[PDB]
């Protein structure tokens, strides 16, 4: 299904990124049939109407639009990137790299916190923000 809008080419991607001025643009790069992307898309669909106020979500198929792979280093199954007014925002998740997500989380509540923190940091002007939790460990006990 994936009723969320999909972007089919770099032109559409850039137009969508530049269209918004006061809402964070979320992009899920990956193949819709990969189970990791399936889980991520499920969560994003759940949170769409919750964070409609200050965020807009979009999905890109890597095969359909491969131009961004080299520049944005899209080689993992699924990645999530955040943009605001044509600026790429970084997040200190503690995983080692602050550019993308690159894995699938399962807690929509934490995803909501990430969106809120990224939006707040972008409005405050920071190009890099700090997530309110560290993912360096999988916190399994």
């Amino acid at each position: 299904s994936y009723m969320l809008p999909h972007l089919h080419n770099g032109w559409q991607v850039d137009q969508a990124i530049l269209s918004e001025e006061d809402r964070v643009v979320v992009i899920r790069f990956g193949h819709d049939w990969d189970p990791t992307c399936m889980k991520m898309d499920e969560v994003l669909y759940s949170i769409a109407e919750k964070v409609k106020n200050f965020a807009v979500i979009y999905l890109v198929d890597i095969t359909e639009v491969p131009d961004f792979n080299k520049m944005y280093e899209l080689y993992d199954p699924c990645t999530v990137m955040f943009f605001f007014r044509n600026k790429h925002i970084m997040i200190d998740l503690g995983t080692g790299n602050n550019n993308k997500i690159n894995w699938a989380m399962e807690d929509k509540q934490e995803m909501v916190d990430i969106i809120e923190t990224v939006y707040r940091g972008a409005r405050k002007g920071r190009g890099l923000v700090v997530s309110p939790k560290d993912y360096s460990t999988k916190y399994r006990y």
Binding site: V13, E73, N86, H88
Partner: peptide
């Protein structure tokens, strides 16, 4: 036009 026309740059 490619994604470079956006004025963006890879990290």
């Amino acid at each position: 036009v490619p994604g470079l026309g956006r004025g963006a740059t890879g990290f």
